[PDB]
Design a protein around this ligand. Structure first.
Ligand SMILES: [Mg+2]
Ligand SMILES: [Mg+2]
Ligand SMILES: [Mg+2]
Ligand SMILES: [Mg+2]
Ligand SMILES: [Mg+2]
Ligand SMILES: [Mg+2]
Ligand SMILES: [Mg+2]
Ligand SMILES: [Mg+2]
Ligand SMILES: [Mg+2]
Ligand SMILES: [Mg+2]
Ligand SMILES: [Mg+2]
Ligand SMILES: [Mg+2]
Ligand SMILES: [Mg+2]
Ligand SMILES: [Mg+2]
Ligand SMILES: [Mg+2]
Ligand SMILES: [Mg+2]
Ligand SMILES: [Mg+2]
Ligand SMILES: [Mg+2]
Ligand SMILES: [Mg+2]
Ligand SMILES: [Mg+2]
Ligand SMILES: [Mg+2]
Ligand SMILES: [Mg+2]
Ligand SMILES: [Mg+2]
Ligand SMILES: [Mg+2]
Ligand SMILES: [Mg+2]
Ligand SMILES: [Mg+2]
Ligand SMILES: [Mg+2]
Ligand SMILES: [Mg+2]
Ligand SMILES: [Mg+2]
Ligand SMILES: [Mg+2]
Ligand SMILES: [Mg+2]
Ligand SMILES: [Mg+2]
Ligand SMILES: [Mg+2]
Ligand SMILES: [Zn+2]
Lengths: 72, 81, 141, 144, 129, 140, 102, 55
RNA sequence: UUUCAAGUCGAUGGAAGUUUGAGGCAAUAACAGGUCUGUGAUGCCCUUAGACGUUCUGGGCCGCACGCGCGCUACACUGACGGAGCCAGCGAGUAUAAGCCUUGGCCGAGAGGUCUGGGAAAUCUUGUGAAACUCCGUCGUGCUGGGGAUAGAGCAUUGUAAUUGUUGCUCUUCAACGAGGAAUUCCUAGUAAGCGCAAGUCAUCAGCUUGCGUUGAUUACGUCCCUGCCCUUUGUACACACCG
């Protein structure tokens, strides 16, 4: 009951995402949920765009598992 | 009428089983051993093995004649068949 | 060498034929597609409301390509699945007849299939022509 | 088809048909909180109101919220099939209806006395709180 | 949600069953009546009415004709408890077998469309302790 | 006609019949290239008979198999056996047996099921239980 | 009504007499220069019936598993109808029944 | 009158619609392959019919 | 290794090296074990016309404060849905009936309806295009899109007859259950576990059995510690044999 993860993305969290995700060894749906406090559905759209924006390199593609890494 | 292969071989067996018990009840006193049904064209040969073939074929073969009639009238067989 | 339907993966070929069939727009879509569920064993309608009919018609077309005189009754069994009987064990139940029958009827007037002799629905003279075409525009990337 | 941001437009708590709806639930499953509105029914009223299901409850504007409650209260006027409705071939007026949050238990109740007033067997077992649909009660339903 | 109000209205309301009020309901023929009730009832009349249901109706009609000071129409007894109540037999009193006794019921208008034996429980309810 | 050999591989119920003809190296599964086998996690099970010997062995031969029966996984093992057995059987008939024994050595040293069909079959069920060995739970 | 493509269907429970009649007909179809096709072994059908052992309902739940194997063979002959029927009387056997269809 | 009531209830498509060849019983009937024999009567006649135990 | 014996354990070859895997049959006697509710199998007793025979109508065998046993669903993310991919084996099937398996076409959201045709069957249903499963999406730890009882309203099928809902379908309601105490069951390889399919009962109804196949392991390959049985020795005042 204590989760209360944020599902709407405001501006303070948005640039915090783009400031924190690059400094990650390994990002995934749970990694985004665990540390950014965002919901699972919001994490999935974030990963699919961050890959389209070039910040994130896709190590492996799968529906149930998305393995991503830093592009730097 | 039109009877399947599975249901036809079973019917022959069921006919044999019912016919065999019929002889056991009727010809019990004559040491009835068994019956062999030899199918043939235009005829249904039935061979009965008994200790005494006089009780079945008695008084000018009256009983065997009167006993084959009980099978034509129960299985709807032609009198010559 | 040439290209056939059998030379391309099934899952992404249907996604390509579905896209063409929607953009072409000539396929007639029945009016209840936004309401109905695909099977009586299903509990919810398809999640891709705008496109589920096109993709299913694409799947039906591809499945008929590889076989000979498949009926509409066989199509219900193919797309049917395990029903969620509450406490009783699961069982396979066929899909809806109208959805499949409308697709093949809709596909029959777009030119890809036709009623085959001795039952079923054959692929049309032009049905082979245009499916093999889509396969080529699938694998260039 | 990408992440977007908003400020001050989200509404945490909604009130529809005198029922409180959590605003952070997806719209299709938020309406299922309204009693008398299931997942199957909520999927169609959102599709009849041209409200794409990819929106949370708070994302909706007032214009959309009123457009949904209008459809739920008048389903047949929006090409919603009769067989899809909650209360079809009504007892008194014979028309197809879909009862909602506060109306459902009232007309559900009215059916119970209507069974009990004629003293039918089904109404009697309903009165006793036992199963009415022929279930065996010798070994099941022993809680309280 | 906008708003809601429930100001219920009337007009000397007569009891009504699926859009048909009691006045027209009773003198509708049972052929027409079955067309506006449930699936089970509609199937039963299409399957063909054997002599037993029709014979009870004829006796029930006569029992009402026996008395014309407008009191209760005297009891007709029957075993056929698979009878479907029709508007023609509203107000009649029937004795319905429960296996042992003739439970007596008076056909109220709200009983229409139900099975005749559904108002006569066949078992005395269990009472532990 | 031409140099054609026909073989088969088997798993539990799945049986894959392989036709190995002389040609440009055409290798299809039920009329579809092996590069698009549905079990992708297991796509390397049928790639093993290829990369073990080297794709150069398939320049002169084309293989078309028809696999039926069994299940999804059981069919993959049947296909890879028909291919492995087909390549060996072609060498024994149209190439020197020295090469055929060479190919058979690498295959056997890697996986016995490439050439030898697995003999395991399902045990029959016996009454008194829901399975072959399993029995209904007992109560006292 | 002369030389015909004629089918003889052989069914029986026991294979020894079935193969004797089958071989005897083939033998007679060999010395007589009659082209033949067969015999064709149809997949044998196992008629299985599984009852409970107990006439009552007491004891361990034990079951019998009875069987009735049915073997069916069809032989195709190219001969006039008079020739094939008399061949049947040559190879008549009580166990095996014969049906002839054109 | 009485003939229209005596044995008047339908006795088709039921368990009482059929009976054993041997014992004319209603319970435990075997209808496979048109045997129409009781399961108890079948065991005592199985060998005669041609059913044997092999496995 | 071994009494160099019976054998056992490793390799190699092999399709198969656990009795090759699995079953069927199965000794000398015995039990007051269970069935006279399988028998036109039976002795005796009871009844035999107001029947305890048989038949017809209706109800009951389902009845519900409770204790117990065989099971089925689940408690979620190794997952639910939504699309898409799409693979078995064991089997069964009719006529002047009293109606079998039913494709294909056409209606219907479904359930289901209708018109033709095939099959007495390796021919047609049927490749029974089964389900788990796999891919791509939605969901995002929430009694939540887990779970689907209970119940309201409605639509079809079978049947003379569905009320005490036969079953199926549609909408709605959406309960306990958040992995279970003391105890206790089954199991060693295509085995266990899932997962379905067919046959039996069957006008209708399979959460049941009998089989079949799909996916497919963990852990011993040992012991007498518990439990049961067998053998040897022993005691006995038991032999109807400790229910002595
Ligand atoms: Mg499927
Ligand atoms: Mg599916
Ligand atoms: Mg489930
Ligand atoms: Mg379930
Ligand atoms: Mg019960
Ligand atoms: Mg009575
Ligand atoms: Mg053995
Ligand atoms: Mg005793
Ligand atoms: Mg007695
Ligand atoms: Mg008795
Ligand atoms: Mg007895
Ligand atoms: Mg007696
Ligand atoms: Mg008796
Ligand atoms: Mg009994
Ligand atoms: Mg019996
Ligand atoms: Mg009496
Ligand atoms: Mg009982
Ligand atoms: Mg009751
Ligand atoms: Mg009761
Ligand atoms: Mg049991
Ligand atoms: Mg038990
Ligand atoms: Mg799903
Ligand atoms: Mg799925
Ligand atoms: Mg077939
Ligand atoms: Mg819930
Ligand atoms: Mg659910
Ligand atoms: Mg429910
Ligand atoms: Mg124990
Ligand atoms: Mg029943
Ligand atoms: Mg069944
Ligand atoms: Mg049972
Ligand atoms: Mg011990
Ligand atoms: Mg002594
Ligand atoms: Zn019997």
């Amino acid at each position: 009951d204590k989760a209360q993860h944020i599902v709407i993305l405001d501006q303070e969290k948005y640039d915090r995402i783009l400031k924190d995700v690059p400094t990650y060894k390994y990002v995934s749906v749970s990694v985004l949920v665990d540390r950014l406090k965002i919901g699972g559905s919001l994490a999935r759209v974030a990963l699919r765009q961050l890959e389209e924006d070039g910040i994130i390199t896709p190590v492996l593609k799968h529906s149930k598992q998305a393995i991503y890494t830093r592009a730097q | 009428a039109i009877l399947s292969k599975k249901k036809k071989l079973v019917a022959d067996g069921v006919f044999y089983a019912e016919l065999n018990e019929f002889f056991t009840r009727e010809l019990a006193e004559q040491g009835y051993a068994g019956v062999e049904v030899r199918k043939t064209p235009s005829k249904l040969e039935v061979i009965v093995k008994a200790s005494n073939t006089q009780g079945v074929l008695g008084e000018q073969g009256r009983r065997i004649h009167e006993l084959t009639s009980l099978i034509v009238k129960r299985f709807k067989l032609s009198p010559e068949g | 060498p040439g290209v056939s339907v059998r030379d391309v993966p099934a899952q992404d070929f249907i996604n390509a034929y579905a896209q063409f069939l929607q953009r072409q727009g000539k396929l007639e879509v029945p009016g209840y597609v936004d309401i109905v569920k695909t099977s009586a064993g299903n509990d919810l309608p398809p999640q891709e409301a705008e496109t589920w009919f096109y993709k299913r018609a694409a799947s039906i077309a591809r499945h008929i390509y590889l076989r000979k005189q498949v009926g509409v009754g066989a199509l219900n069994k193919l797309y049917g699945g395990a029903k969620n009987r509450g406490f009783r064990p699961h069982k396979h139940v066929d899909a809806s007849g109208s959805i499949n029958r409308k697709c093949v009827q809709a596909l029959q007037k777009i030119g890809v299939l036709e009623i085959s002799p001795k039952g079923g629905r054959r692929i049309s003279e032009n049905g082979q022509r245009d499916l093999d075409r889509i396969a080529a525009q699938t694998l260039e990337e | 088809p990408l992440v977007v941001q908003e400020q001050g437009s989200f509404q945490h708590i909604l009130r529809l048909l005198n029922t409180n709806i959590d605003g952070r639930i997806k719209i299709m499953y938020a309406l299922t909180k309204i009693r008398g509105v299931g997942r199957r029914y909520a999927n169609l009223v959102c599709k009849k109101a041209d409200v794409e299901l990819t929106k949370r409850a708070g994302e909706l504007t007032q214009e959309e919220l009123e457009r949904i409650v209008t459809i739920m209260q008048n389903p047949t006027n929006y090409k919603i099939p009769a067989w899809f409705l909650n209360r079809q071939k009504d007892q008194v007026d014979g028309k197809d209806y879909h009862v909602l949050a506060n109306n459902l238990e009232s007309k559900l109740r009215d059916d119970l006395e209507r069974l009990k007033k004629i003293r039918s067997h089904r109404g009697i077992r309903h009165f006793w709180g036992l199963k009415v649909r022929g279930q065996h009660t010798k070994t099941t339903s022993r809680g309280r | 949600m906008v708003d809601a109000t429930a100001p219920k209205k009337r007009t000397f309301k007569q009891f009504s069953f699926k859009g048909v009020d009691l006045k027209d309901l009773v003198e509708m023929p049972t052929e027409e009546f079955t067309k506006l009730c449930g699936a089970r009832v509609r199937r039963r009349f299409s399957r063909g009415l054997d002599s037993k249901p029709m014979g009870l109706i004829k006796k029930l009609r006569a029992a009402r004709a026996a008395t014309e000071p407008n009191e209760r129409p005297a009891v007709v007894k029957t075993h056929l408890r698979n009878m479907i109540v029709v508007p023609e037999m509203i107000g009649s009193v029937v004795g319905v077998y429960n296996g042992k006794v003739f439970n007596t019921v008076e056909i109220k208008p709200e009983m229409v469309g139900h099975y005749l034996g559904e108002f006569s429980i066949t078992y005395t309810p269990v009472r532990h302790g | 006609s031409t140099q054609s050999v026909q073989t088969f591989g088997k798993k539990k119920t799945a049986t894959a019949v392989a036709h190995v003809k002389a040609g440009k190296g055409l290798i299809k599964i039920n009329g579809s290239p092996i590069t698009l086998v549905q079990p992708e996690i297991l796509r390397f099970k049928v790639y093993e008979p290829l990369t073990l010997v080297g794709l150069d062995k398939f320049q002169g031969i084309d293989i078309r198999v028809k696999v039926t029966g069994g299940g999804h996984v059981s069919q993959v093992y049947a296909i890879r056996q028909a291919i492995a057995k087909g390549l060996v059987a072609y060498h024994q008939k149209y190439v020197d047996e020295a090469s055929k024994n060479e190919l058979k050595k690498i295959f056997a040293s890697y996986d016995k099921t490439l050439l030898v069909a697995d003999s395991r079959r399902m045990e029959p069920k016996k009454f008194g239980g829901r399975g072959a060995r399993a029995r209904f739970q007992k109560s006292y | 009504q002369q030389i015909h493509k004629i089918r003889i269907t052989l069914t029986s429970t026991k294979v020894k007499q079935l193969e004797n009649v089958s071989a005897n007909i083939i033998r007679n179809a060999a010395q007589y220069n009659i082209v033949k096709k067969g015999p064709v072994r149809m997949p044998t059908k196992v008629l299985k019936i599984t009852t409970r052992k107990t006439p009552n309902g007491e004891g361990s739940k034990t079951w019998d598993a009875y069987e009735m194997r049915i073997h069916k063979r069809v032989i195709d002959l190219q001969a006039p109808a008079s020739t094939v029927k008399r061949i049947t009387q040559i190879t008549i056997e009580p166990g095996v029944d014969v049906e002839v269809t054109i | 009158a009485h003939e229209n009531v005596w044995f008047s209830h339908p006795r088709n498509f039921g368990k009482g619609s059929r009976q054993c060849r041997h014992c004319s019983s209603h319970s435990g009937l075997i209808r496979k392959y048109g045997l129409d024999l009781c399961r108890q009567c079948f065991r005592e006649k199985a060998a005669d019919i041609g059913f044997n135990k092999y496995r």
